[PDB]
Amino acid sequence: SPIDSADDLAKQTKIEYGAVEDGATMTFFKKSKISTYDKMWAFMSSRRQ
Amino acid sequence: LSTRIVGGIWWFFTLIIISSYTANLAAFLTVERMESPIDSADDLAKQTKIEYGAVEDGATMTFFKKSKISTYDKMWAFMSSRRQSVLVKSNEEGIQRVLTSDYAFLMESTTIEFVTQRNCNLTQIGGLIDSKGYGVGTPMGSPYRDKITIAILQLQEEGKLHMMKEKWWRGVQNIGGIFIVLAAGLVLSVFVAV
Amino acid sequence: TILGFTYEIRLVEDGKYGAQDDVNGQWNGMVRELIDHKADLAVAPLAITYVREKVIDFSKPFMTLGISILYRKPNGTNPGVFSFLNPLSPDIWMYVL
Amino acid sequence: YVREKVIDFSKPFMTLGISILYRKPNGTNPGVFSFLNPLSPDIWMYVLLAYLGVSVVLFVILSTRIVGGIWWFFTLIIISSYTANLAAFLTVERMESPIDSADDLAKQTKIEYGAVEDGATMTFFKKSKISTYDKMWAFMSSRRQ
Ligand SMILES: C/C(=C\C=C/[C@@H](C)C(=O)O)[C@H]1CN[C@H](C(=O)O)[C@H]1CC(=O)O
Numbered sequence: 001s002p003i004d005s006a007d008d009l010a011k012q013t014k015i016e017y018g019a020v021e022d023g024a025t026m027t028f029f030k031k032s033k034i035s036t037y038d039k040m041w042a043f044m045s046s047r048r049q
Numbered sequence: 050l051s052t053r054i055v056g057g058i059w060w061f062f063t064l065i066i067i068s069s070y071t072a073n074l075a076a077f078l079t080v081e082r083m084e085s086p087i088d089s090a091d092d093l094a095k096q097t098k099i100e101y102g103a104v105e106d107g108a109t110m111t112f113f114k115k116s117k118i119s120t121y122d123k124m125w126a127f128m129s130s131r132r133q134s135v136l137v138k139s140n141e142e143g144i145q146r147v148l149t150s151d152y153a154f155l156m157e158s159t160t161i162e163f164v165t166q167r168n169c170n171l172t173q174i175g176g177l178i179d180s181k182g183y184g185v186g187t188p189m190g191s192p193y194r195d196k197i198t199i200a201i202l203q204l205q206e207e208g209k210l211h212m213m214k215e216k217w218w219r220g221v222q223n224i225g226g227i228f229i230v231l232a233a234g235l236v237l238s239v240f241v242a243v
Numbered sequence: 244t245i246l247g248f249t250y251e252i253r254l255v256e257d258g259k260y261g262a263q264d265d266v267n268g269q270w271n272g273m274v275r276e277l278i279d280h281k282a283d284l285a286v287a288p289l290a291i292t293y294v295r296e297k298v299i300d301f302s303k304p305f306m307t308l309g310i311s312i313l314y315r316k317p318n319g320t321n322p323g324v325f326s327f328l329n330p331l332s333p334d335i336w337m338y339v340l
Numbered sequence: 341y342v343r344e345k346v347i348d349f350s351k352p353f354m355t356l357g358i359s360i361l362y363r364k365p366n367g368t369n370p371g372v373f374s375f376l377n378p379l380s381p382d383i384w385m386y387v388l389l390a391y392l393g394v395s396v397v398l399f400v401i402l403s404t405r406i407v408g409g410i411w412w413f414f415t416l417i418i419i420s421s422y423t424a425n426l427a428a429f430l431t432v433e434r435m436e437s438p439i440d441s442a443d444d445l446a447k448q449t450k451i452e453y454g455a456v457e458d459g460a461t462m463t464f465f466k467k468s469k470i471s472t473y474d475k476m477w478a479f480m481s482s483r484r485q
């Protein structure tokens with residue numbers, strides 16, 4: 001289905017997603033313990049390059 | 050000769066139309082039947098579209114604080130992230146938030162049983178996540194300090210506390226429309242037949 | 244009926260089943276009500292909490308329960324005729340006409 | 341190792357593993373003895389009334405062409421709807437599968453699964469680092485009571 005949330009961004013790994021390396025991004029969900037943002041952090045750190 | 054080809058063209062054109070309609074109807078019924086509602090606490094532990102919460106100032110929040118379940122820990126992390134935004138103090142504030150907004154409210158089974166007897170629009174999800182007792186504190190040397198397990202336990206065995214508990218809160222369609230359209234077509238055919 | 248004692252049921256002055264403040268360490272609410280010269284005897288259960296069970300003579304709970312989720316339920320129906328009302332456009336029915 | 345560091349064991353006379361006992365999927369066999377394996381009988385009563393109305397129309401009687409067209413479209417819509425419902429039921433049947441491994445049990449939370457209270461199996465799952473067994477142990481600790 002159409003995505004409409006970051007939860008479905010965490011669910012769907014076919015669409016690649018990331019952010020800026022340094023700054024507020026990649027630090028907010030790095031320290032976060034919410035499972036959606038933790039899975040998104042794991043996916044982004046898997047594709048850090 | 051050409052009229053037979055014309056009728057065959059209409060025949061498989063109508064076949065193509067009804068095959069497309071059958072495919073769309075099958076897709077709609079499949080996506081409707083594939084959907085599932087919330088039926089566990091792990092649904093709230095994973096899905097973050099529906100915001101949730103509890104009361105403030107401890108009680109359940111203390112069990113969130115010292116949680117070791119590692120899914121209840123995720124629920125505590127989300128609730129601490131949304132402590133200032135989506136969280137209420139009393140039970141009635143969260144209960145109306147369930148009815149108004151897409152909100153789920155974590156409570157004891159007694160109050161949830163009370164509001165589901167009160168309103169038929171409410172439902173209970175999940176079993177006993179954290180086993181919680183309710184009692185009455187007692188003086189030192191009080192008779193009911195020992196008689197909570199002796200006399201008040203005997204009143205519970207006689208069900209008088211259960212008598213108070215049971216005293217206070219106690220306890221097609223589109224096819225028919227298609228048939229209506231068919232009857233209207235029968236009416237039109239009789240009106241043509243006059 | 245157990246004892247025959249006299250009692251005056253009264254509202255609490257804080258309105259809280261109070262926990263502590265970790266910036267101060269003092270325990271407030273009903274826990275402070277048992278230390279602020281009202282009743283050294285325990286009164287309120289504050290449900291079950293571990294430090295609340297460390298109060299002077301916390302009795303056994305008479306009632307047992309658990310924590311679950313209250314959630315409103317969704318409901319919907321499809322009355323009338325909806326074979327003509329597919330997610331496909333009515334211009335397909337115009338093409339049929 | 342929690343028992344080996346306290347008392348002494350011999351060499352094992354036999355070796356074994358831990359696996360899943362489950363009820364066999366043979367049984368609950370659908371047939372015409374079991375009711376409502378096809379759809380609801382209200383639609384069948386409605387099409388019996390439709391055939392009765394068609395017989396009434398043929399009794400009381402260009403116009404027959406549009407009677408046949410209306411009957412053709414009505415029956416075609418009803419059979420297409422039954423086909424779509426049957427296809428949706430078969431798709432949600434084949435979409436689910438019987439459990440074949442531990443991760444298959446870990447994904448589907450419809451079937452409850454646990455072990456013996458404080459046994460060596462639950463001790464193994466508590467001290468497990470693989471994510472499938474960690475998820476299964478998290479599910480077991482969720483329903484530990
Ligand atoms: C896009 C961006 C920085 C990008 C590149 C360089 C200059 C850096 O990260 O230092 C900013 C935008 N404002 C953010 C902040 O204020 O932290 C910062 C990173 C972000 O987008 O979160």
Ligand SMILES: C/C(=C\C=C/[C@@H](C)C(=O)O)[C@H]1CN[C@H](C(=O)O)[C@H]1CC(=O)O
Nearest residue numbers: 104105106108138139259260261289290
């Ligand atoms: C509403 C409430 C706690 C939340 C906020 C304030 C009012 C407080 O007691 O500090 C209480 C009511 N009785 C429960 C208890 O004794 O633990 C607790 C919430 C509940 O679990 O229903």
